[PDB]
Design a protein around this ligand. Structure first.
Ligand SMILES: C=CC1=C(C)/C(=C/c2[nH]c(/C=C3N=C(/C=C4\NC(=O)C(C)=C4C=C)C(C)=C\3CCC(=O)O)c(CCC(=O)O)c2C)NC1=O
Ligand SMILES: C=CC1=C(C)/C(=C/c2[nH]c(/C=C3N=C(/C=C4\NC(=O)C(C)=C4C=C)C(C)=C\3CCC(=O)O)c(CCC(=O)O)c2C)NC1=O
Ligand SMILES: C=CC1=C(C)/C(=C/c2[nH]c(/C=C3N=C(/C=C4\NC(=O)C(C)=C4C=C)C(C)=C\3CCC(=O)O)c(CCC(=O)O)c2C)NC1=O
Ligand SMILES: C=CC1=C(C)/C(=C/c2[nH]c(/C=C3N=C(/C=C4\NC(=O)C(C)=C4C=C)C(C)=C\3CCC(=O)O)c(CCC(=O)O)c2C)NC1=O
Ligand SMILES: C=CC1=C(C)/C(=C/c2[nH]c(/C=C3N=C(/C=C4\NC(=O)C(C)=C4C=C)C(C)=C\3CCC(=O)O)c(CCC(=O)O)c2C)NC1=O
Lengths: 96, 96
């Protein structure tokens, strides 16, 4: 499988907000094909960015999400966004 | 009216590609409400970024585009993008 990590940047004190958005909004992509579920990681030390860690059977699994329903997902939340940045770190799973 | 300028960053030699996309690939949003048409500016000196200069009757006119049909527009082109960056510079038209 592959892993996509998204380092999301959130101004101070808006992590609860960004958190309520994964909960009280649309945490729904677990029926995307090849999706193996994600973790949302709140930073405590070494870090100030939220990490979204997602596993997938393949990269084509990932691209089905990104290049399909993601471009149009969560329009309102992205029209009024709480995040101020992101980076997509992309890996191959070599051990477990 | 207001003016939104988008400094699009494009790697070397892909300005023709980004140009075919504004021409032969859906240059169409001139019937978006409050839209007053755009110019696409190819840089020659002082600059390496393409500028998209758009005028609008109001910012709400602009937001109708961005927060409406733009989050879902040109999906394929954004799935295979030729640009590597952008910035939204926003102004009020004070003289003309
Ligand atoms: C649709 C999927 C989508 C794609 C393909 C996408 C591409 C994309 N967005 C970026 C930044 C960014 N993109 C946005 C926001 C948006 N960008 C948009 O295309 C839309 C609709 C919004 C909605 C508000 C912001 C706020 C940044 C960073 C700006 C900053 O860091 O200040 C960057 C990199 C900036 C850089 O590296 O120089 C890329 C490649 N962003 C997306 O959300
Ligand atoms: C593929 C892994 C992945 C998944 C499945 C995912 C789901 C997801 N991303 C969210 C926020 C977000 N998601 C992104 C960016 C992205 N979202 C993407 O799917 C991709 C590929 C990017 C860009 C790298 C950003 C910037 C936010 C904060 C949105 C906000 O400000 O409210 C939310 C909260 C709703 C919201 O605020 O809009 C969910 C449920 N995010 C991920 O990163
Ligand atoms: C909320 C859910 C959300 C989703 C699902 C989303 C989709 C999304 N964001 C992307 C890139 C991107 N999107 C952003 C940032 C943003 N994009 C925005 O819509 C906003 C508001 C921001 C800013 C907070 C950045 C910076 C990238 C490029 C990430 C990178 O490659 O480093 C991409 C292209 C990823 C790829 O294939 O490489 C997608 C599909 N953007 C979202 O925000
Ligand atoms: C301001 C009004 C505005 C309009 C009406 C507009 C239209 C427009 N933008 C395009 C490319 C693009 N448009 C953007 C970004 C944006 N597009 C937006 O409407 C906004 C608000 C942003 C972000 C600030 C980028 C990054 C490209 C290059 C896409 C590519 O690499 O193919 C294209 C070419 C098709 C494509 O490549 O997808 C058109 C016709 N661009 C603008 O900037
Ligand atoms: C092609 C047509 C296209 C459209 C119509 C589009 C819409 C779009 N891009 C946006 C931000 C943004 N979009 C990008 C960049 C990208 N976004 C991408 O989809 C890709 C591939 C890149 C990078 C090459 C960036 C960097 C911002 C934030 C610009 C800023 O706020 O200064 C926004 C929010 C603008 C705002 O209200 O602040 C919209 C509506 N993005 C597009 O690319």
């Amino acid at each position: 499988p592959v892993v996509k990590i998204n380092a999301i940047e959130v101004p101070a004190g808006a992590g609860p907000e960004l958190e309520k958005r994964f909960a009280h909004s649309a945490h729904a992509v677990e029926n995307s094909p090849g999706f193996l579920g994600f973790q949302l990681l709140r930073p405590v030390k070494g870090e100030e960015r939220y990490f979204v860690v997602t596993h997938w059977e393949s990269d084509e699994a990932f691209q089905a999400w990104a290049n399909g329903p993601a471009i149009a997902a969560h329009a309102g939340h992205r029209a009024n966004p709480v995040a101020t940045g992101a980076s997509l770190l992309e890996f191959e799973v070599v051990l477990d």
